[PDB]
Ligand binder design. Structure first.
Ligand SMILES: Nc1ncnc2c1ncn2[C@@H]1O[C@H](COP(=O)(O)OP(=O)(O)CP(=O)(O)O)[C@@H](O)[C@H]1O
Ligand SMILES: N=C(N)NCCCCN
Ligand SMILES: [Mg+2]
Ligand SMILES: [Mg+2]
Ligand SMILES: [N+]
Ligand SMILES: [Zn+2]
Length: 420
Protein backbone atom coordinates (compact mmCIF):
# COMPACT_ATOMS: atom_id res chain seq x y z
CA UNK A 1 0.00 0.00 0.00
CA UNK A 2 0.87 3.69 -0.26
CA UNK A 3 1.91 5.10 3.12
CA UNK A 4 2.97 8.58 4.24
CA UNK A 5 5.98 8.54 6.56
CA UNK A 6 6.69 11.57 8.71
CA UNK A 7 9.75 12.30 10.87
CA UNK A 8 11.26 15.02 13.04
CA UNK A 9 13.07 16.16 16.19
CA UNK A 10 16.00 13.86 15.22
CA UNK A 11 19.01 16.15 15.08
CA UNK A 12 20.80 17.96 17.84
CA UNK A 13 22.93 21.09 17.98
CA UNK A 14 25.80 18.57 17.89
CA UNK A 15 25.62 17.66 14.18
CA UNK A 16 22.84 15.50 12.77
CA UNK A 17 19.71 16.72 10.96
CA UNK A 18 16.20 15.62 10.07
CA UNK A 19 16.26 15.33 6.24
CA UNK A 20 19.65 13.72 6.27
CA UNK A 21 18.11 11.06 8.47
CA UNK A 22 15.13 11.14 6.10
CA UNK A 23 17.39 10.67 3.07
CA UNK A 24 18.92 7.67 4.78
CA UNK A 25 15.56 6.23 5.75
CA UNK A 26 14.50 6.77 2.12
CA UNK A 27 17.59 4.99 0.80
CA UNK A 28 17.02 2.07 3.16
CA UNK A 29 13.33 1.85 2.24
CA UNK A 30 14.03 1.64 -1.50
CA UNK A 31 16.35 -1.33 -1.09
CA UNK A 32 14.35 -3.37 1.43
CA UNK A 33 10.66 -2.61 1.01
CA UNK A 34 9.48 -0.63 -2.02
CA UNK A 35 10.11 2.80 -3.55
CA UNK A 36 9.58 6.49 -2.82
CA UNK A 37 6.70 8.11 -4.70
CA UNK A 38 7.53 11.67 -5.75
CA UNK A 39 9.73 13.90 -3.59
CA UNK A 40 10.08 14.16 0.15
CA UNK A 41 8.64 17.27 1.83
CA UNK A 42 10.39 19.78 4.07
CA UNK A 43 7.60 21.37 6.10
CA UNK A 44 8.41 24.48 8.15
CA UNK A 45 6.36 24.81 11.32
CA UNK A 46 5.53 27.64 13.69
CA UNK A 47 8.85 29.57 13.88
CA UNK A 48 8.36 31.15 17.33
CA UNK A 49 8.55 27.87 19.25
CA UNK A 50 11.42 27.21 21.70
CA UNK A 51 13.36 23.92 21.28
CA UNK A 52 14.35 24.74 17.68
CA UNK A 53 18.04 25.73 17.57
CA UNK A 54 17.43 26.34 14.83
CA UNK A 55 14.64 26.57 12.24
CA UNK A 56 11.57 24.37 12.55
CA UNK A 57 10.94 21.82 9.80
CA UNK A 58 9.75 18.23 9.94
CA UNK A 59 10.08 15.81 6.98
CA UNK A 60 7.70 13.44 5.17
CA UNK A 61 7.61 11.18 2.09
CA UNK A 62 5.23 8.79 0.32
CA UNK A 63 6.08 5.09 -0.26
CA UNK A 64 4.65 1.84 -1.64
CA UNK A 65 5.04 -1.29 0.52
CA UNK A 66 3.38 -4.63 1.25
CA UNK A 67 3.60 -4.48 5.04
CA UNK A 68 3.26 -1.41 7.26
CA UNK A 69 5.06 -3.03 10.20
CA UNK A 70 8.27 -3.78 8.34
CA UNK A 71 8.33 -0.22 7.05
CA UNK A 72 8.04 1.00 10.64
CA UNK A 73 10.84 -1.46 11.56
CA UNK A 74 13.08 -0.05 8.85
CA UNK A 75 12.48 3.60 9.77
CA UNK A 76 12.90 2.58 13.42
CA UNK A 77 16.30 1.02 12.74
CA UNK A 78 17.50 4.11 10.84
CA UNK A 79 16.61 6.41 13.73
CA UNK A 80 18.39 4.21 16.27
CA UNK A 81 21.72 4.37 14.40
CA UNK A 82 21.64 7.97 13.29
CA UNK A 83 19.55 10.02 15.67
CA UNK A 84 21.32 12.03 18.35
CA UNK A 85 19.55 10.19 21.19
CA UNK A 86 22.20 11.39 23.64
CA UNK A 87 20.88 14.96 23.66
CA UNK A 88 18.07 15.98 26.01
CA UNK A 89 16.36 18.37 23.60
CA UNK A 90 16.30 15.69 20.89
CA UNK A 91 13.09 13.63 20.92
CA UNK A 92 12.45 11.76 17.66
CA UNK A 93 8.94 11.02 16.47
CA UNK A 94 7.71 9.12 13.47
CA UNK A 95 4.33 8.30 11.95
CA UNK A 96 3.01 6.06 9.22
CA UNK A 97 -0.20 7.13 7.60
CA UNK A 98 -2.41 5.68 4.89
CA UNK A 99 -2.74 8.03 1.90
CA UNK A 100 -6.46 8.73 2.24
CA UNK A 101 -5.95 9.53 5.91
CA UNK A 102 -3.30 12.23 5.57
CA UNK A 103 -5.99 14.62 4.38
CA UNK A 104 -7.71 14.28 7.74
CA UNK A 105 -4.46 15.66 9.16
CA UNK A 106 -4.60 19.05 7.38
CA UNK A 107 -6.07 21.04 10.30
CA UNK A 108 -3.50 19.57 12.73
CA UNK A 109 -0.64 20.57 10.45
CA UNK A 110 -2.14 24.00 10.07
CA UNK A 111 -2.34 24.46 13.80
CA UNK A 112 1.32 23.37 13.91
CA UNK A 113 2.41 26.04 11.47
CA UNK A 114 0.32 28.94 12.70
CA UNK A 115 -0.37 27.98 16.31
CA UNK A 116 0.97 25.98 19.28
CA UNK A 117 0.39 22.27 20.03
CA UNK A 118 0.64 19.95 23.03
CA UNK A 119 1.94 16.38 22.84
CA UNK A 120 -1.30 15.06 24.29
CA UNK A 121 -3.00 16.44 21.14
CA UNK A 122 -0.70 14.47 18.85
CA UNK A 123 -1.30 11.45 21.08
CA UNK A 124 -5.05 11.90 20.92
CA UNK A 125 -4.91 11.80 17.11
CA UNK A 126 -2.67 8.75 16.90
CA UNK A 127 -5.14 6.79 19.03
CA UNK A 128 -8.06 8.32 17.16
CA UNK A 129 -6.75 6.93 13.88
CA UNK A 130 -4.72 3.92 15.07
CA UNK A 131 -1.76 5.51 13.29
CA UNK A 132 1.29 3.30 13.69
CA UNK A 133 4.01 5.44 15.23
CA UNK A 134 7.45 5.71 16.79
CA UNK A 135 8.10 7.75 19.93
CA UNK A 136 11.65 7.35 21.12
CA UNK A 137 11.90 9.47 24.26
CA UNK A 138 9.65 12.36 24.93
CA UNK A 139 7.38 11.81 21.96
CA UNK A 140 7.68 15.45 21.00
CA UNK A 141 8.78 14.77 17.43
CA UNK A 142 5.38 13.22 16.85
CA UNK A 143 3.74 16.68 16.47
CA UNK A 144 6.06 17.76 13.67
CA UNK A 145 5.68 14.33 12.10
CA UNK A 146 1.90 14.44 11.98
CA UNK A 147 2.31 18.00 10.68
CA UNK A 148 4.75 17.00 7.95
CA UNK A 149 2.02 14.63 6.78
CA UNK A 150 -1.11 16.78 7.06
CA UNK A 151 0.31 19.96 5.52
CA UNK A 152 -1.54 21.00 2.38
CA UNK A 153 0.57 23.08 0.02
CA UNK A 154 -1.14 25.67 -2.16
CA UNK A 155 2.02 27.61 -2.78
CA UNK A 156 5.18 25.54 -2.38
CA UNK A 157 8.85 25.93 -3.25
CA UNK A 158 11.79 23.65 -3.82
CA UNK A 159 15.10 23.23 -2.03
CA UNK A 160 17.99 21.24 -3.37
CA UNK A 161 19.79 20.13 -0.21
CA UNK A 162 23.37 19.06 -0.83
CA UNK A 163 25.11 16.93 1.83
CA UNK A 164 28.71 16.52 3.00
CA UNK A 165 30.64 13.27 3.30
CA UNK A 166 30.67 12.13 6.98
CA UNK A 167 34.52 12.26 7.31
CA UNK A 168 33.94 15.96 6.83
CA UNK A 169 31.44 17.25 9.42
CA UNK A 170 32.21 19.66 12.20
CA UNK A 171 34.94 20.76 9.81
CA UNK A 172 34.77 24.00 7.85
CA UNK A 173 32.93 23.83 4.53
CA UNK A 174 34.95 24.52 1.40
CA UNK A 175 33.41 26.33 -1.56
CA UNK A 176 33.81 28.82 -4.40
CA UNK A 177 31.93 32.03 -3.63
CA UNK A 178 31.71 33.73 -7.02
CA UNK A 179 30.57 30.33 -8.29
CA UNK A 180 27.35 31.04 -6.34
CA UNK A 181 26.78 34.66 -7.33
CA UNK A 182 27.38 33.87 -10.98
CA UNK A 183 24.73 31.17 -10.57
CA UNK A 184 22.21 33.57 -9.03
CA UNK A 185 22.76 36.15 -11.79
CA UNK A 186 22.18 33.46 -14.42
CA UNK A 187 19.07 31.91 -12.89
CA UNK A 188 17.51 34.39 -10.47
CA UNK A 189 14.67 34.42 -9.81
CA UNK A 190 14.25 30.73 -10.79
CA UNK A 191 16.64 30.16 -7.89
CA UNK A 192 16.21 32.82 -5.23
CA UNK A 193 17.32 33.75 -1.70
CA UNK A 194 20.51 31.74 -2.15
CA UNK A 195 22.81 34.73 -1.78
CA UNK A 196 22.81 38.31 -0.46
CA UNK A 197 24.25 40.67 -3.06
CA UNK A 198 23.97 43.95 -1.15
CA UNK A 199 25.85 42.33 1.77
CA UNK A 200 28.43 40.30 -0.18
CA UNK A 201 27.49 37.23 1.83
CA UNK A 202 26.53 33.77 0.59
CA UNK A 203 23.35 32.61 2.26
CA UNK A 204 22.55 29.01 1.27
CA UNK A 205 25.49 27.72 3.30
CA UNK A 206 25.05 26.77 6.97
CA UNK A 207 27.58 27.83 9.59
CA UNK A 208 26.92 24.68 11.55
CA UNK A 209 28.32 21.20 12.34
CA UNK A 210 25.57 19.31 10.48
CA UNK A 211 25.66 17.24 7.27
CA UNK A 212 24.24 19.99 5.04
CA UNK A 213 26.67 21.48 2.52
CA UNK A 214 24.25 23.87 0.85
CA UNK A 215 20.49 24.14 0.52
CA UNK A 216 19.43 25.96 -2.63
CA UNK A 217 15.90 27.40 -2.94
CA UNK A 218 14.13 27.61 -6.30
CA UNK A 219 11.06 27.03 -8.45
CA UNK A 220 11.64 24.14 -10.84
CA UNK A 221 13.64 20.93 -10.82
CA UNK A 222 15.36 22.06 -14.03
CA UNK A 223 16.58 25.34 -12.49
CA UNK A 224 17.80 23.64 -9.29
CA UNK A 225 19.78 21.07 -11.29
CA UNK A 226 21.30 23.95 -13.24
CA UNK A 227 22.30 25.53 -9.93
CA UNK A 228 23.97 22.30 -8.89
CA UNK A 229 26.31 21.73 -11.83
CA UNK A 230 27.08 25.46 -11.95
CA UNK A 231 28.39 25.67 -8.39
CA UNK A 232 31.89 24.70 -7.19
CA UNK A 233 32.27 23.12 -3.73
CA UNK A 234 33.88 20.33 -1.72
CA UNK A 235 32.64 16.91 -2.94
CA UNK A 236 28.91 16.35 -2.67
CA UNK A 237 27.99 12.95 -1.31
CA UNK A 238 24.20 12.92 -0.86
CA UNK A 239 21.70 15.21 -2.64
CA UNK A 240 17.93 15.62 -2.39
CA UNK A 241 15.31 17.95 -3.85
CA UNK A 242 12.54 18.81 -1.40
CA UNK A 243 9.11 20.30 -1.98
CA UNK A 244 8.72 22.86 0.83
CA UNK A 245 6.69 25.73 2.31
CA UNK A 246 9.72 28.00 2.44
CA UNK A 247 8.87 31.49 1.22
CA UNK A 248 5.07 31.29 1.21
CA UNK A 249 4.07 33.22 4.36
CA UNK A 250 2.03 30.17 5.29
CA UNK A 251 2.57 31.12 8.94
CA UNK A 252 1.00 34.60 8.81
CA UNK A 253 -2.38 35.15 10.37
CA UNK A 254 -4.64 37.86 8.95
CA UNK A 255 -5.92 40.39 11.48
CA UNK A 256 -9.52 39.73 10.34
CA UNK A 257 -9.06 36.21 11.73
CA UNK A 258 -8.46 37.00 15.39
CA UNK A 259 -9.80 38.81 18.48
CA UNK A 260 -6.67 39.46 20.54
CA UNK A 261 -3.00 39.26 19.57
CA UNK A 262 -0.78 36.61 21.09
CA UNK A 263 2.87 35.84 21.65
CA UNK A 264 4.09 32.83 19.62
CA UNK A 265 2.09 33.82 16.52
CA UNK A 266 2.83 35.72 13.33
CA UNK A 267 0.67 38.32 11.62
CA UNK A 268 -0.27 40.51 8.70
CA UNK A 269 -1.81 43.63 10.22
CA UNK A 270 -2.59 47.25 9.28
CA UNK A 271 -2.03 50.22 11.57
CA UNK A 272 -1.26 53.92 11.82
CA UNK A 273 2.00 54.99 13.44
CA UNK A 274 1.63 56.28 16.99
CA UNK A 275 5.10 56.40 18.49
CA UNK A 276 7.94 57.27 16.11
CA UNK A 277 10.96 55.01 15.46
CA UNK A 278 13.63 55.07 18.19
CA UNK A 279 16.98 53.27 18.06
CA UNK A 280 18.22 50.77 20.65
CA UNK A 281 21.10 48.67 22.07
CA UNK A 282 22.14 46.15 19.43
CA UNK A 283 21.08 48.47 16.63
CA UNK A 284 17.32 48.16 16.80
CA UNK A 285 14.53 50.49 15.75
CA UNK A 286 11.22 50.45 17.61
CA UNK A 287 7.92 52.17 16.88
CA UNK A 288 4.20 51.76 17.56
CA UNK A 289 0.95 51.74 15.59
CA UNK A 290 -2.80 51.81 16.22
CA UNK A 291 -4.78 48.72 15.24
CA UNK A 292 -8.11 47.01 15.86
CA UNK A 293 -6.17 45.57 18.80
CA UNK A 294 -4.91 48.89 20.20
CA UNK A 295 -1.31 50.11 20.38
CA UNK A 296 1.26 47.56 19.14
CA UNK A 297 5.07 47.42 19.26
CA UNK A 298 6.79 46.84 15.91
CA UNK A 299 10.54 46.36 15.67
CA UNK A 300 13.23 45.89 13.08
CA UNK A 301 16.16 44.15 14.78
CA UNK A 302 19.82 44.84 13.98
CA UNK A 303 20.26 41.74 11.77
CA UNK A 304 17.79 43.30 9.31
CA UNK A 305 20.62 45.79 8.72
CA UNK A 306 19.77 48.40 6.04
CA UNK A 307 16.09 47.49 6.29
CA UNK A 308 16.32 49.64 9.42
CA UNK A 309 16.93 52.70 7.24
CA UNK A 310 13.64 52.31 5.37
CA UNK A 311 11.98 52.03 8.78
CA UNK A 312 13.60 55.08 10.41
CA UNK A 313 11.84 57.15 7.71
CA UNK A 314 8.54 56.78 9.55
CA UNK A 315 6.39 59.60 10.93
CA UNK A 316 3.25 59.56 13.10
CA UNK A 317 0.04 59.08 11.10
CA UNK A 318 1.52 56.85 8.40
CA UNK A 319 -0.81 54.09 7.20
CA UNK A 320 1.07 50.81 7.23
CA UNK A 321 0.83 47.03 6.86
CA UNK A 322 3.31 44.91 8.79
CA UNK A 323 4.43 41.27 8.46
CA UNK A 324 6.17 39.40 11.28
CA UNK A 325 6.12 37.37 14.48
CA UNK A 326 5.06 38.45 17.95
CA UNK A 327 7.48 37.55 20.73
CA UNK A 328 7.64 39.33 24.10
CA UNK A 329 4.73 41.52 23.02
CA UNK A 330 6.50 42.93 19.95
CA UNK A 331 6.35 42.36 16.17
CA UNK A 332 9.61 41.27 14.57
CA UNK A 333 9.35 42.84 11.13
CA UNK A 334 10.00 40.51 8.21
CA UNK A 335 8.28 42.56 5.50
CA UNK A 336 6.43 45.89 5.31
CA UNK A 337 3.94 47.70 3.08
CA UNK A 338 3.63 51.45 3.38
CA UNK A 339 0.12 52.03 2.10
CA UNK A 340 -0.65 55.72 2.46
CA UNK A 341 2.03 58.19 3.51
CA UNK A 342 0.96 60.82 6.02
CA UNK A 343 0.50 64.30 4.51
CA UNK A 344 2.14 67.05 6.60
CA UNK A 345 1.21 70.71 5.95
CA UNK A 346 3.87 73.12 7.22
CA UNK A 347 3.83 76.92 7.38
CA UNK A 348 7.34 78.37 7.15
CA UNK A 349 8.74 81.84 6.44
CA UNK A 350 8.97 83.18 2.90
CA UNK A 351 12.11 82.29 0.97
CA UNK A 352 13.84 85.44 -0.23
CA UNK A 353 13.26 85.74 -4.03
CA UNK A 354 16.71 87.24 -4.61
CA UNK A 355 19.26 85.49 -2.35
CA UNK A 356 17.27 82.34 -1.56
CA UNK A 357 17.72 82.41 2.19
CA UNK A 358 14.71 82.34 4.52
CA UNK A 359 13.28 85.73 5.47
CA UNK A 360 13.56 86.54 9.15
CA UNK A 361 10.62 87.97 11.10
CA UNK A 362 10.22 91.70 10.38
CA UNK A 363 9.09 92.21 13.96
CA UNK A 364 5.74 91.48 15.63
CA UNK A 365 3.10 92.10 12.98
CA UNK A 366 5.47 93.50 10.38
CA UNK A 367 5.56 90.46 8.13
CA UNK A 368 8.98 89.38 6.88
CA UNK A 369 11.92 90.75 4.96
CA UNK A 370 15.39 89.97 3.76
CA UNK A 371 17.56 92.79 5.07
CA UNK A 372 20.35 91.65 2.72
CA UNK A 373 18.21 93.01 -0.12
CA UNK A 374 15.40 95.56 -0.05
CA UNK A 375 12.96 92.68 -0.41
CA UNK A 376 9.83 92.01 1.62
CA UNK A 377 6.97 89.56 1.94
CA UNK A 378 3.88 89.64 4.16
CA UNK A 379 2.71 86.01 4.42
CA UNK A 380 3.96 82.47 5.09
CA UNK A 381 4.39 79.80 2.40
CA UNK A 382 2.66 76.44 3.09
CA UNK A 383 4.06 73.22 1.61
CA UNK A 384 4.01 69.44 1.82
CA UNK A 385 7.13 67.71 3.18
CA UNK A 386 9.08 65.47 0.78
CA UNK A 387 10.75 62.47 2.44
CA UNK A 388 12.68 59.68 0.70
CA UNK A 389 9.86 57.20 1.17
CA UNK A 390 7.89 55.76 -1.73
CA UNK A 391 4.70 53.83 -0.96
CA UNK A 392 4.74 50.09 -1.51
CA UNK A 393 6.57 47.02 -0.22
CA UNK A 394 9.92 46.56 1.55
CA UNK A 395 11.55 43.36 2.79
CA UNK A 396 14.59 42.50 4.90
CA UNK A 397 17.72 41.38 3.06
CA UNK A 398 18.06 37.69 2.11
CA UNK A 399 20.61 37.12 4.89
CA UNK A 400 17.86 37.99 7.36
CA UNK A 401 15.05 36.05 5.68
CA UNK A 402 13.07 33.59 7.76
CA UNK A 403 12.33 30.19 6.21
CA UNK A 404 8.57 30.92 5.91
CA UNK A 405 9.00 34.64 4.97
CA UNK A 406 7.60 35.22 1.46
CA UNK A 407 10.07 37.35 -0.55
CA UNK A 408 8.84 40.24 -2.71
CA UNK A 409 10.22 38.69 -5.88
CA UNK A 410 7.46 36.09 -5.55
CA UNK A 411 4.55 38.47 -4.95
CA UNK A 412 2.75 39.85 -8.02
CA UNK A 413 1.82 43.17 -6.36
CA UNK A 414 3.23 46.59 -7.29
CA UNK A 415 5.68 48.86 -5.49
CA UNK A 416 8.18 46.13 -4.66
CA UNK A 417 11.58 47.51 -3.67
CA UNK A 418 13.97 44.64 -4.19
CA UNK A 419 17.43 45.92 -3.34
CA UNK A 420 20.50 44.50 -5.08
N1 LIG B 1 3.41 24.55 16.40
C1 LIG B 1 4.04 23.69 17.25
N2 LIG B 1 3.61 23.55 18.53
C2 LIG B 1 4.20 22.72 19.40
N3 LIG B 1 5.24 21.97 19.03
C3 LIG B 1 5.74 22.04 17.77
C4 LIG B 1 5.15 22.89 16.84
N4 LIG B 1 5.84 22.76 15.68
C5 LIG B 1 6.83 21.84 15.85
N5 LIG B 1 6.76 21.40 17.10
C6 LIG B 1 7.68 20.40 17.73
O1 LIG B 1 8.87 21.07 18.33
C7 LIG B 1 9.96 20.26 18.05
C8 LIG B 1 10.85 21.01 17.12
O2 LIG B 1 12.29 21.06 17.43
P1 LIG B 1 13.35 20.26 16.28
O3 LIG B 1 14.41 19.74 16.97
O4 LIG B 1 12.60 19.20 15.65
O5 LIG B 1 13.89 21.25 15.18
P2 LIG B 1 13.04 21.36 13.73
O6 LIG B 1 12.74 21.38 12.63
O7 LIG B 1 13.08 22.69 14.15
C9 LIG B 1 14.93 21.34 13.16
P3 LIG B 1 16.80 21.31 12.38
O8 LIG B 1 17.30 21.62 10.75
O9 LIG B 1 18.30 21.65 13.03
O10 LIG B 1 17.62 19.97 12.10
C10 LIG B 1 9.42 19.06 17.36
O11 LIG B 1 9.22 18.06 18.33
C11 LIG B 1 8.20 19.47 16.82
O12 LIG B 1 7.32 18.34 16.62
N1 LIG C 1 18.91 28.20 1.93
C1 LIG C 1 19.03 29.37 1.36
N2 LIG C 1 19.24 29.45 0.07
N3 LIG C 1 18.93 30.58 2.13
C2 LIG C 1 18.69 30.51 3.54
C3 LIG C 1 18.56 31.78 4.32
C4 LIG C 1 19.16 31.82 5.68
C5 LIG C 1 19.32 33.13 6.37
N4 LIG C 1 19.67 33.12 7.77
MG1 LIG D 1 15.15 17.89 15.49
MG1 LIG E 1 11.78 19.09 12.93
N1 LIG F 1 -3.30 16.03 3.44
ZN1 LIG G 1 18.08 88.32 -0.15
Amino acid sequence: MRVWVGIDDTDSSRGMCTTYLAVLAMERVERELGKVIGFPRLIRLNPTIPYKTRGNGAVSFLVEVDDVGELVDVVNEVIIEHAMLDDEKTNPGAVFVDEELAVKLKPFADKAIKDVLQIDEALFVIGKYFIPHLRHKKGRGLIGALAAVGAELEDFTLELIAYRYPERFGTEREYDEESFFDMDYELYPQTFDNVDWCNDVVVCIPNTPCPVLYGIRGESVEALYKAMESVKTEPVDRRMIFVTNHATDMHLIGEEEVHRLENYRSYRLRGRVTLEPYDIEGGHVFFEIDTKFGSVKCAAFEPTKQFRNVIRLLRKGDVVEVYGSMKKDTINLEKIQIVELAEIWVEKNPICPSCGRRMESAGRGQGFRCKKCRTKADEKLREKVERELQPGFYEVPPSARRHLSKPLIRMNVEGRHIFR
